[PDB]
Design a protein around this ligand. Structure first.
Ligand SMILES: CN(c1ncnc2[nH]ccc12)[C@H]1C[C@@H](NS(C)(=O)=O)C1
Length: 278
């Protein structure tokens, strides 16, 4: 009762590959809408993500629904619940009006809960950005993609990633950029950046990529990571968004301590934000 027949998954539109499908075995279009993750070779990677998501059960983590086999039973698809409001990246610009600071801080708490739960299971997300934070409702958010998530080996503080794959470098901590080492503290750094996005209502002009590119200047490509490391070494950071209170920025800056050991924890973040609400 967690297997989806590929012929029954009717594609609607791309979500991010991740596609919106309607699983409709009765053929009367009454079937339920679902998010489907497939390959655009790296079947072993998607199988790892499936094992990860099936093992996550939390209010602030997108629900695993099942798996769809691509014949001759040689391919796999990840089936997830579909949240129509989409990611913060698409939702926040559309609702700058109803979403105040209180609501943004509740989202920050929820992301931190989802991430702390992820941390307790010994995983590093390595891709925490607003595009990966889904809106269940105006009161609830969920971490919605685990495509770069890795399990930290027992008795180790981090996972080392040595591959030819792409990385969200404008969300990465110094240790990730310099040594390819990913700690729970590196996810804390990425949360800080995600929180910046959320506070700027995911305005494209104020995105971490747009701001850092304006700081770094004209840059290839192959030199982006070095220029970014240098900027972070000098102590430069994403500026406090307009009308962002000191208390929130101070928490945001604690996610951005150059050394991983000097950063705050997700639990200290939960408590910090919760103390600001009402
Ligand atoms: C937007 N989105 C989703 N939207 C609605 N309902 C969903 N259920 C699950 C995912 C999902 C996912 C595509 C992922 N983002 S990406 C391509 O940058 O990795 C997040």
């Amino acid at each position: 009762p967690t297997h989806f027949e590929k012929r029954f998954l009717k594609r609607i539109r791309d979500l991010g590959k991740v596609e919106l499908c309607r699983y409709d075995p009765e053929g009367d279009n009454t079937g339920e809408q679902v998010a489907v993750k497939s390959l655009k070779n790296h079947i072993a990677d998607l199988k790892k993500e499936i094992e990860i998501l099936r093992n996550l059960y939390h209010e602030n983590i997108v629900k695993y629904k099942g798996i769809c086999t691509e014949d001759g039973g040689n391919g796999i698809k990840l089936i997830m619940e579909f949240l129509p409001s989409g990611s913060l990246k698409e939702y926040l610009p559309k609702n700058k009006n109803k979403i105040n600071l209180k609501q943004q801080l509740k989202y920050a708490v929820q992301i931190c809960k989802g991430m702390d739960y992820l941390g307790s299971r010994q995983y590093v997300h390595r891709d925490l950005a607003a595009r990966n934070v889904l809106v269940e409702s105006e009161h609830q958010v969920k971490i919605g993609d685990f495509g770069l998530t890795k399990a930290i080996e027992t008795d180790k503080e981090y996972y080392t990633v040595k591959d030819d794959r792409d990385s969200p470098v404008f969300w990465y901590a110094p240790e990730c950029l310099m040594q390819s080492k990913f700690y729970i503290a590196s996810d804390v750094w990425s949360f800080g950046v995600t929180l910046h996005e959320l506070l700027t209502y995911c305005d494209s002009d104020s995105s971490p990529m747009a701001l850092f590119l304006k700081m770094i200047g004209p840059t290839h490509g192959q030199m982006t990571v070095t220029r970014l490391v240098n900027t972070l070494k000098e102590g430069k950071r994403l500026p406090c968004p307009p009308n962002c209170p000191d208390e929130v920025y101070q928490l945001m800056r604690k996610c951005w301590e150059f050394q991983p050991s000097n950063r705050t924890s997700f639990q200290n973040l939960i408590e910090g934000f919760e103390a600001l609400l009402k």
